[PDB]
Amino acid sequence: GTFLFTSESVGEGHPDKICDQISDAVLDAHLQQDPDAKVACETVAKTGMILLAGEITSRAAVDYQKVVREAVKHIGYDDSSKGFDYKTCNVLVALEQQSPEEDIGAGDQGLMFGYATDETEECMPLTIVLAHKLNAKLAELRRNGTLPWLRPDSKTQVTVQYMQDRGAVLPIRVHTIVISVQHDEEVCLDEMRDALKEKVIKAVVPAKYLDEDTIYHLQPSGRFVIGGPQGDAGLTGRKIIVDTYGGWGAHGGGAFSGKDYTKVDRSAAYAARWVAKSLVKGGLCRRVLVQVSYAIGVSHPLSISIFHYGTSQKSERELLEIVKKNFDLRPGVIVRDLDLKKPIYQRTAAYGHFGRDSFPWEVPKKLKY
Amino acid sequence: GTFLFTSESVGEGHPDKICDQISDAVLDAHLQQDPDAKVACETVAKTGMILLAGEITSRAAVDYQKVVREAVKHIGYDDSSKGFDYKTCNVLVALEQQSPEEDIGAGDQGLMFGYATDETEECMPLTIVLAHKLNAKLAELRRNGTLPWLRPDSKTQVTVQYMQDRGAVLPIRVHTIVISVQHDEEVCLDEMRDALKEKVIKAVVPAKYLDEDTIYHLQPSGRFVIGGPQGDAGLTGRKIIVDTYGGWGAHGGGAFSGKDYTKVDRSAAYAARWVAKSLVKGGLCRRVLVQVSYAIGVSHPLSISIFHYGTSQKSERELLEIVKKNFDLRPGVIVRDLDLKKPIYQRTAAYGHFGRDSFPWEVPKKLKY
Ligand SMILES: [K+]
Ligand SMILES: [K+]
Ligand SMILES: [Mg+2]
Ligand SMILES: [Mg+2]
């Protein structure tokens, strides 16, 4: 009665994730000057290029060359030996900016999902949490000089064996771990593989989940000197399952980064997480999936759905009534409840938007019923 | 004991979908000359621009100006009055091409899901099937001159009320429909709304699913003259839930368009659909979710998982054994079974990759057990 489940994450220097962080660096820059900025900033990265495209309504005057280049510096691409350099890369701006509310209409149509699971303290699947932490660990050891051969582009994948308990899920052991990470010309493969096991995996994954049968795919393709935008074109919103629940729960298709609160792709997904987490932390269920949907120009959600996997004594209809009584999921109210005009978005753009840093949507609401 | 569920689709002229079709037009062009072409083509669209970026290993010499512009012509953007024109738009190429197997390694790490449901004949959720068909209907009426005021950019959203039957799902009625579609300067709103109800919705949605309480959001934002890449920047792989199951089942994060068979994002997702559909059409279950995962450089999947929603008399472990005995999910075998070197991909890039046209992955395998 066991099953395998797999989730992945990627590091800050992965080209898709570079674009997410830049898109959010742009959004933060606008919001610092104009809290009411409307932003739909897409970023594209390739060998020697960052291109920005999209539509903005804002009173801000933003230095795109300075914002983009500082974001690439933070990530760690600061020399041509690493395949990309903030000092000398091309930055092209194709943004179209115009000068310029409880019941504001949704900025678009779409559907969004929230999810929570009691298998971890942060109410997230173990598979995705470990995957994220492996990439975070790599960045730490790169930045503090423990493994100076490390470069910013990385990918991890974690397969966990579960058992199920009346619709809830219980992690037993890690079955397989993959790690691929960009590196300098000097470091040999055996040194890298040894370090990824001892200094990364064993520092991150609780020892009770590792055993002698755990499968390790470390630098499985061999060498990986060419990385970042040089090796692989990147686009904003191409890591949406990394950003959310790692294959668990569900997704409505919408990207997060480069978008203001009126874009319910972001705001309503954050709120649905908040609802899902509030239901689990309030003891109403162990595992829960929440769907919402919107029409452009209309404030109230078109639909709200709760799925509890059989982990509640209450019916799904009862949980829906509790949600309706405790949450107002119009964009103009979510913005107040979750403080979404604050320029906090660049910090969400790597290592997942959920299960860390106690952002407002991770602080559960106390429920009246 | 009922619940709402919502799914969306978009038309061919939606900017994200323009990019998917162009990316696949590029892939098809390479495969026509070189069946073994390796392609990772990303497309970006904005006011007056199409940009191609990515990595190619191929012997083909492809006329990118001709391929891109013909794809935009097919879509219907052929005049500046429509906001975009294949004859006069900018085409920028940043592709990096190099000159150049049963047990070929996966081209990347990742996870992929397949899904099938017996609620429709095509084994797809009704919500997403109707959403797609509404957009297809709009394109038909535009192209045959019934509604000459229609332009190529459109979006639809369908909310259906379901009941559940031992883990299977049964559609009762359509609860809400949204349609937003780009139009000329002359047509008035009442004429558009009347036509969208009578000539689009009533032609597409079976009358047994429509009643007097069905909610209609037709041109809900008002007017919508500015559309396509002018109104909204587009990128390849930003409609991945539209491309697959509309919120149902699950997704691994990977985009389809612009990718050859070695990119398991595409090939293994197509195969997992094939597995899921084969299990339902073979009578082993009514509804089923299949996960697979891979490591870059490794041929065999790292994990395979089956979830039947309680709709089988067999255990999930038993269904997994049947899958293993009947399917080889290495990329180098899927390529033969599903004929993935054939240049058929541009036709997959709108209206979903599943539930139509009897592509090889929609023809179920007869299962030995
Ligand atoms: K790519
Ligand atoms: K956009
Ligand atoms: Mg990518
Ligand atoms: Mg988009």
Curated annotation (Swiss-Prot), chains A, B:
Cofactor: Mg(2+); K(+)
Pathway in which this enzyme or protein is active: Amino-acid biosynthesis; S-adenosyl-L-methionine biosynthesis; S-adenosyl-L-methionine from L-methionine: step 1/1
Glycyl lysine isopeptide (Lys-Gly) (interchain with G-Cter in SUMO2) crosslink site(s): 202, 208
This protein's UniProt keywords: Acetylation, ATP-binding, Isopeptide bond, Magnesium, Metal-binding, Nucleotide-binding, One-carbon metabolism, Phosphoprotein, Potassium, Transferase, Ubl conjugation
Highest taxon above the source species: Eukaryota
Catalytically driven reaction(s): L-methionine + ATP + H2O = S-adenosyl-L-methionine + phosphate + diphosphate
Binding site for K(+): 42
Signal peptide annotation: none
Modification Phosphoserine, positions: 99, 358
Gene Ontology molecular function terms on file: ATP binding; identical protein binding; metal ion binding; methionine adenosyltransferase activity; small molecule binding
GO BP, sorted A to Z: cellular response to leukemia inhibitory factor; cellular response to methionine; one-carbon metabolic process; positive regulation of TORC1 signaling; protein heterooligomerization; protein hexamerization; S-adenosylmethionine biosynthetic process
InterPro entries: ADOMET_SYNTHASE_CS, S-AdoMet_synt_C, S-AdoMet_synt_central, S-AdoMet_synt_N, S-AdoMet_synthetase, S-AdoMet_synthetase_sfam
Residue spans crossing the bilayer: none
Keyword Repeat: no
Modification type N6-acetyllysine: residues: 66
NCBIfam families on file: metK
HAMAP family, A to Z: S_AdoMet_synth1
Family to which the UniProt record says this protein belongs: Belongs to the AdoMet synthase family.
Name of the protein in question: S-adenosylmethionine synthase isoform type-2
Biological source species: Homo sapiens (Human)
Gene coding for it: MAT2A
